[PDB]
Design an enzyme around this catalytic site. Structure first.
Site, PDB file in Angstrom:
ATOM      1  NE  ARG A   4      58.401  84.677  49.476  1.00 26.63           N
ATOM      2  CZ  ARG A   4      57.885  85.739  49.745  1.00 26.63           C
ATOM      3  NH1 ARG A   4      58.268  86.820  50.655  1.00 26.63           N
ATOM      4  NH2 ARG A   4      56.437  85.807  49.489  1.00 26.63           N
ATOM      5  CG  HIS A  53      55.442  81.888  58.306  1.00 30.43           C
ATOM      6  ND1 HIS A  53      55.386  83.123  58.881  1.00 30.43           N
ATOM      7  CD2 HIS A  53      54.049  81.830  57.345  1.00 30.43           C
ATOM      8  CE1 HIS A  53      54.447  83.683  58.624  1.00 30.43           C
ATOM      9  NE2 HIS A  53      53.725  83.230  57.572  1.00 30.43           N
ATOM     10  CE  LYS A  92      54.059  88.962  57.388  1.00 32.36           C
ATOM     11  NZ  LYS A  92      54.162  87.516  57.107  1.00 32.36           N
ATOM     12  CE  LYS A 121      45.178  86.045  66.237  1.00 34.40           C
ATOM     13  NZ  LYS A 121      46.753  86.594  65.957  1.00 34.40           N
ATOM     14  NE  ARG A 172      54.011  94.034  66.662  1.00 33.50           N
ATOM     15  CZ  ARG A 172      53.196  93.076  67.409  1.00 33.50           C
ATOM     16  NH1 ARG A 172      53.616  91.924  67.634  1.00 33.50           N
ATOM     17  NH2 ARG A 172      52.098  93.494  67.721  1.00 33.50           N
ATOM     18  CG  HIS A 183      47.015  82.780  57.819  1.00 38.24           C
ATOM     19  ND1 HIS A 183      47.640  84.062  58.041  1.00 38.24           N
ATOM     20  CD2 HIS A 183      46.229  82.482  58.562  1.00 38.24           C
ATOM     21  CE1 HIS A 183      47.230  84.636  59.034  1.00 38.24           C
ATOM     22  NE2 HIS A 183      46.359  83.652  59.476  1.00 38.24           N
ATOM     23  CG  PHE A 184      52.303  81.711  61.857  1.00 36.54           C
ATOM     24  CD1 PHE A 184      51.838  82.842  62.722  1.00 36.54           C
ATOM     25  CD2 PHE A 184      53.060  80.820  62.069  1.00 36.54           C
ATOM     26  CE1 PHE A 184      52.301  82.299  64.153  1.00 36.54           C
ATOM     27  CE2 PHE A 184      53.368  80.551  63.233  1.00 36.54           C
ATOM     28  CZ  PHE A 184      52.907  81.408  64.394  1.00 36.54           C
ATOM     29  CG  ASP A 185      45.069  82.781  62.427  1.00 32.81           C
ATOM     30  OD1 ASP A 185      45.008  83.865  61.775  1.00 32.81           O
ATOM     31  OD2 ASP A 185      44.282  82.660  63.376  1.00 32.81           O
TER      32      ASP A 185
HETATM   33  O1  LIG Z   1      53.813  85.650  60.802  1.00 31.33           O
HETATM   34  C1  LIG Z   1      52.609  85.946  61.157  1.00 31.33           C
HETATM   35  N1  LIG Z   1      51.774  86.190  60.288  1.00 31.33           N
HETATM   36  C2  LIG Z   1      50.484  86.761  60.801  1.00 31.33           C
HETATM   37  N2  LIG Z   1      50.162  87.029  61.765  1.00 31.33           N
HETATM   38  C3  LIG Z   1      51.104  86.778  62.872  1.00 31.33           C
HETATM   39  C4  LIG Z   1      52.528  86.283  62.425  1.00 31.33           C
HETATM   40  N3  LIG Z   1      53.159  86.175  63.450  1.00 31.33           N
HETATM   41  C5  LIG Z   1      52.547  86.588  64.812  1.00 31.33           C
HETATM   42  N4  LIG Z   1      51.354  87.099  64.293  1.00 31.33           N
HETATM   43  C6  LIG Z   1      50.123  87.686  65.178  1.00 31.33           C
HETATM   44  O2  LIG Z   1      50.245  88.873  65.484  1.00 31.33           O
HETATM   45  C7  LIG Z   1      50.153  89.010  66.589  1.00 31.33           C
HETATM   46  C8  LIG Z   1      50.859  90.367  67.299  1.00 31.33           C
HETATM   47  O3  LIG Z   1      49.876  91.333  66.867  1.00 31.33           O
HETATM   48  P1  LIG Z   1      48.887  92.147  67.940  1.00 31.33           P
HETATM   49  O4  LIG Z   1      47.447  91.621  67.663  1.00 31.33           O
HETATM   50  O5  LIG Z   1      48.971  93.564  67.866  1.00 31.33           O
HETATM   51  O6  LIG Z   1      49.342  91.954  69.173  1.00 31.33           O
HETATM   52  C9  LIG Z   1      50.701  87.931  67.330  1.00 31.33           C
HETATM   53  O7  LIG Z   1      50.086  87.659  68.548  1.00 31.33           O
HETATM   54  C10 LIG Z   1      50.275  86.741  66.523  1.00 31.33           C
HETATM   55  O8  LIG Z   1      48.971  86.213  66.640  1.00 31.33           O
HETATM   56  O1  LIG Z   2      44.982  81.721  54.325  1.00 39.17           O
HETATM   57  C1  LIG Z   2      45.440  82.224  53.429  1.00 39.17           C
HETATM   58  N1  LIG Z   2      45.738  81.500  52.248  1.00 39.17           N
HETATM   59  C2  LIG Z   2      46.318  82.110  51.185  1.00 39.17           C
HETATM   60  N2  LIG Z   2      47.075  82.945  51.169  1.00 39.17           N
HETATM   61  C3  LIG Z   2      46.918  84.247  52.483  1.00 39.17           C
HETATM   62  C4  LIG Z   2      46.076  83.493  53.488  1.00 39.17           C
HETATM   63  N3  LIG Z   2      45.925  84.422  54.493  1.00 39.17           N
HETATM   64  C5  LIG Z   2      46.808  85.619  54.129  1.00 39.17           C
HETATM   65  N4  LIG Z   2      47.463  85.412  53.012  1.00 39.17           N
HETATM   66  C6  LIG Z   2      48.277  86.084  52.136  1.00 39.17           C
HETATM   67  O2  LIG Z   2      49.475  85.726  52.011  1.00 39.17           O
HETATM   68  C7  LIG Z   2      50.371  86.239  53.013  1.00 39.17           C
HETATM   69  C8  LIG Z   2      50.391  85.216  54.190  1.00 39.17           C
HETATM   70  O3  LIG Z   2      51.241  85.848  55.250  1.00 39.17           O
HETATM   71  P1  LIG Z   2      51.106  85.377  56.643  1.00 39.17           P
HETATM   72  O4  LIG Z   2      49.655  86.023  57.161  1.00 39.17           O
HETATM   73  O5  LIG Z   2      51.819  86.126  57.533  1.00 39.17           O
HETATM   74  O6  LIG Z   2      51.107  83.798  56.870  1.00 39.17           O
HETATM   75  C9  LIG Z   2      49.467  87.289  53.449  1.00 39.17           C
HETATM   76  O7  LIG Z   2      50.371  88.743  53.229  1.00 39.17           O
HETATM   77  C10 LIG Z   2      48.252  87.625  52.564  1.00 39.17           C
HETATM   78  O8  LIG Z   2      48.517  88.387  51.671  1.00 39.17           O
HETATM   79  O1  LIG Z   3      45.007  81.469  74.214  1.00 43.55           O
HETATM   80  C1  LIG Z   3      45.224  82.490  73.490  1.00 43.55           C
HETATM   81  N1  LIG Z   3      43.738  82.754  72.742  1.00 43.55           N
HETATM   82  C2  LIG Z   3      43.870  83.524  71.762  1.00 43.55           C
HETATM   83  N2  LIG Z   3      45.284  84.412  71.455  1.00 43.55           N
HETATM   84  C3  LIG Z   3      46.295  84.105  72.264  1.00 43.55           C
HETATM   85  C4  LIG Z   3      46.185  83.137  73.186  1.00 43.55           C
HETATM   86  N3  LIG Z   3      47.187  82.990  73.862  1.00 43.55           N
HETATM   87  C5  LIG Z   3      48.313  83.728  73.190  1.00 43.55           C
HETATM   88  N4  LIG Z   3      47.566  84.231  72.324  1.00 43.55           N
HETATM   89  C6  LIG Z   3      48.207  85.302  71.424  1.00 43.55           C
HETATM   90  O2  LIG Z   3      48.003  86.821  71.633  1.00 43.55           O
HETATM   91  C7  LIG Z   3      47.495  87.499  70.546  1.00 43.55           C
HETATM   92  C8  LIG Z   3      45.942  88.093  70.996  1.00 43.55           C
HETATM   93  O3  LIG Z   3      46.296  89.169  72.128  1.00 43.55           O
HETATM   94  P1  LIG Z   3      45.516  90.410  71.705  1.00 43.55           P
HETATM   95  O4  LIG Z   3      46.121  91.299  70.643  1.00 43.55           O
HETATM   96  O5  LIG Z   3      45.832  91.431  73.055  1.00 43.55           O
HETATM   97  O6  LIG Z   3      44.363  90.301  71.444  1.00 43.55           O
HETATM   98  C9  LIG Z   3      46.952  86.297  69.453  1.00 43.55           C
HETATM   99  O7  LIG Z   3      47.600  87.009  68.282  1.00 43.55           O
HETATM  100  C10 LIG Z   3      47.903  85.188  69.905  1.00 43.55           C
HETATM  101  O8  LIG Z   3      49.056  85.117  69.150  1.00 43.55           O
END
Ligand SMILES: O=c1[nH]cnc2c1ncn2[C@@H]1O[C@H](COP(=O)(O)O)[C@@H](O)[C@H]1O
Ligand SMILES: O=c1[nH]cnc2c1ncn2[C@@H]1O[C@H](COP(=O)(O)O)[C@@H](O)[C@H]1O
Ligand SMILES: O=c1[nH]cnc2c1ncn2[C@@H]1O[C@H](COP(=O)(O)O)[C@@H](O)[C@H]1O
EC number: 4.6.1.18
Length: 124
Positions: free
Chosen positions: A10, A12, A41, A66, A85, A119-121
């Site tokens: 749903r 992603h 979100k 992470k 975003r 989960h999307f990391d």
């Molecule tokens: O759908 C998502 N679920 C959880 N984390 C995400 C998702 N999409 C992007 N992110 C992470 O959130 C980061 C943006 O937040 P930031 O750490 O403030 O830069 C991206 O770099 C991704 O790693």
């Molecule tokens: O690894 C996981 N397994 C099951 N649920 C998770 C996991 N990580 C986060 N969640 C929960 O389910 C959602 C996943 O969203 P996402 O991190 O954007 O993929 C988050 O709002 C959390 O409440």
């Molecule tokens: O090589 C990588 N290592 C870790 N994070 C990465 C890398 N390349 C892109 N990213 C993205 O950048 C974000 C980390 O950026 P930060 O918020 O400035 O620490 C992560 O959430 C990833 O989605």
């Protein structure tokens, strides 16, 4: 009722479009997938590949999550994705998003039997 695996689909999966290339896309999709229900979100990624291809990532490159857990996997191939975003001026319930298309490797966490994305990391 909704499994973690279903929630991942749903939040992603958007196989229907090759690239989320309307400037409106995130505004529409973040709402329709119910990601603006209890709050805006802050960030969410949609993946424009087949479900099978995204599920296959759970058998691909094992990388640290992470959060320090060990159950994350990075796609060997780049995938078509859309980053949504929340804008600085977005105010719930009127959630507003910047839409950005990219081709990047995705990192997902996998759990369960079957072992599937829950989960999307990150995208890299
Ligand atoms: O759908 C998502 N679920 C959880 N984390 C995400 C998702 N999409 C992007 N992110 C992470 O959130 C980061 C943006 O937040 P930031 O750490 O403030 O830069 C991206 O770099 C991704 O790693
Ligand atoms: O690894 C996981 N397994 C099951 N649920 C998770 C996991 N990580 C986060 N969640 C929960 O389910 C959602 C996943 O969203 P996402 O991190 O954007 O993929 C988050 O709002 C959390 O409440
Ligand atoms: O090589 C990588 N290592 C870790 N994070 C990465 C890398 N390349 C892109 N990213 C993205 O950048 C974000 C980390 O950026 P930060 O918020 O400035 O620490 C992560 O959430 C990833 O989605």
């Amino acid at each position: 009722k909704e499994t973690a695996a279903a929630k991942f689909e749903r939040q992603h999966m958007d196989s229907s479009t090759s690239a989320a290339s309307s400037s409106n896309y995130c505004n529409q999709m973040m709402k329709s997938r119910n990601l603006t229900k209890d709050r805006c979100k802050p960030v969410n990624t949609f993946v424009h590949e087949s479900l099978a291809d995204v599920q296959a990532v759970c058998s691909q490159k094992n990388v640290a999550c992470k959060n320090g857990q060990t159950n994350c996997y990075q796609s060997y191939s780049t995938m078509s994705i859309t980053d949504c975003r929340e804008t600085g001026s977005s105010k719930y319930p009127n959630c507003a998003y910047k839409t950005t298309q990219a081709n990047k490797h995705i990192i997902v966490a996998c759990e369960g039997n079957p072992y599937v994305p829950v989960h999307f990391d990150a995208s890299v």
